[PDB]
Amino acid sequence: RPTFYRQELNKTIWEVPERYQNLSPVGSGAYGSVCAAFDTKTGHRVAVKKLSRPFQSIIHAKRTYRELRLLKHMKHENVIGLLDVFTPARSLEEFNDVYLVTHLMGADLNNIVKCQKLTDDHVQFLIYQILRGLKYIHSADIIHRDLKPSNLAVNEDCELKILDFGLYVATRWYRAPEIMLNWMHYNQTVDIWSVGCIMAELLTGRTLFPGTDHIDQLKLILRLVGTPGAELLKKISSESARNYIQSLAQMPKMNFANVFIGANPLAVDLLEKMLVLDSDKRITAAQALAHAYFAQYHDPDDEPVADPYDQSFESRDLLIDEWKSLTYDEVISFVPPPLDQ
Numbered sequence: 385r386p387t388f389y390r391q392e393l394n395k396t397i398w399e400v401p402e403r404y405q406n407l408s409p410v411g412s413g414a415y416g417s418v419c420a421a422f423d424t425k426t427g428h429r430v431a432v433k434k435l436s437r438p439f440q441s442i443i444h445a446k447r448t449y450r451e452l453r454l455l456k457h458m459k460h461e462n463v464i465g466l467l468d469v470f471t472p473a474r475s476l477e478e479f480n481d482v483y484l485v486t487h488l489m490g491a492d493l494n495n496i497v498k499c500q501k502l503t504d505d506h507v508q509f510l511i512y513q514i515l516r517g518l519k520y521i522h523s524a525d526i527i528h529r530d531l532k533p534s535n536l537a538v539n540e541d542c543e544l545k546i547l548d549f550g551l552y553v554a555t556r557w558y559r560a561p562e563i564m565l566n567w568m569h570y571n572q573t574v575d576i577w578s579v580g581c582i583m584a585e586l587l588t589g590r591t592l593f594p595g596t597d598h599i600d601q602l603k604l605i606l607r608l609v610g611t612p613g614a615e616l617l618k619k620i621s622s623e624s625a626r627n628y629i630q631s632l633a634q635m636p637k638m639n640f641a642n643v644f645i646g647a648n649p650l651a652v653d654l655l656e657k658m659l660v661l662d663s664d665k666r667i668t669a670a671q672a673l674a675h676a677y678f679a680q681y682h683d684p685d686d687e688p689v690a691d692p693y694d695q696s697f698e699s700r701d702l703l704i705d706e707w708k709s710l711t712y713d714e715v716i717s718f719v720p721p722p723l724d725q
């Protein structure tokens with residue numbers, strides 16, 4: 385066990401190993417209760433998140449366990465990973481606080497598009513890295529579900545990582561129509577719809593579908609992709625949903641070349657394959673990596689899949705102290721990543 389030291393920052397008690405120095409809060413609460421710190425073992429800047437009221441309810445306790453499980457799993461270049469996890473507690477009985485350590489990322493894409501309209505080369509490289517991380521996540525049967533520019537972090541070298549900061553940029557603007565609506569018939573490709581919306585915004589400098597609500601959002605979407613045909617209508621099981629869709633005056637699919645005018649036609653083609661209403665016909669991440677648009681980056685020998693992830697906990701209903709105990713187990717069993725850098 386290492387030696388901890390205590391301090392206070394902006395309303396909150398922080399107790400961390402001497403290893404981590406010079407804590408400075410970042411983001412004004414936009415990312416949680418998070419500090420930049422200097423890690424004395426590597427000489428690298430890191431981010432330290434202290435979880436807020438991790439075991440306050442069964443729901444918090446489960447969310448805490450879930451976040452720690454997901455973070456301990458993620459071992460890929462384009463996905464946030466876990467550098468360390470600790471608590472000042474010496475025993476389960478004392479266990480009340482969870483701290484997570486990750487790399488400190490430079491800026492999010494919300495900032496980087498709200499600066500400029502990117503070059504086609506920058507778009508290629510950023511979307512390629514998103515899809516490479518998604519291939520990995522998806523291969524473990526994990527769905528992100530909340531992809532949007534503020535959940536992607538990029539460093540000065542343009543290296544990108546996928547994260548989820550949790551609850552400016554509305555989620556609904558990037559969300560696939562099938563989980564705007566029924567939340568019933570959906571696959572991993574809900575994340576590919578989000579990548580299509582992100583890529584459009586990078587190319588044009590404008591949010592593709594800036595809806596005010598779920599109805600408006602859907603209206604904007606149908607105006608681009610057109611109203612469902614009989615084949616897609618065949619597969620909507622919700623009567624209310626189906627009634628609403630068919631209630632609208634029918635709309636044709638736009639020619640995406642006339643919408644994204646002047647863009648690389650290969651970018652336009654990929655967007656046609658990502659922004660399809662029918663989720664069974666939407667391109668997967670693994671397929672998108674082989675698309676000609678990424679010819680300069682794609683290497684099929686360097687697009688790894690993940691180890692399997694045991695999500696079986698998700699279907700369990702346990703007590704607070706049980707989720708807490710499990711979370712403690714996971715803190716204890718943590719094996720830090722190689723230092724080599």
Ligand SMILES: CCC(CC)NC(=O)[C@H](CCC1CCCCC1)NC(=O)c1ccc(CNC(=O)c2cnn(-c3ccccc3)c2N)cc1
Pocket residue numbers: 410411415418431432433450451454455458463464484485486487488489490491492521527528537546547548549550551
């Ligand atoms: C917390 C809510 C919950 C909602 C679901 N989500 C999670 O469970 C995921 C877990 C893993 C996910 C799973 C899906 C794929 C992406 C990773 N959890 C994280 O992604 C997660 C993300 C971050 C952290 C701690 N690090 C920071 O806060 C941090 C790092 N750099 N910067 C920075 C960025 C730009 C400029 C300046 C500074 C920060 N602010 C710790 C966990």
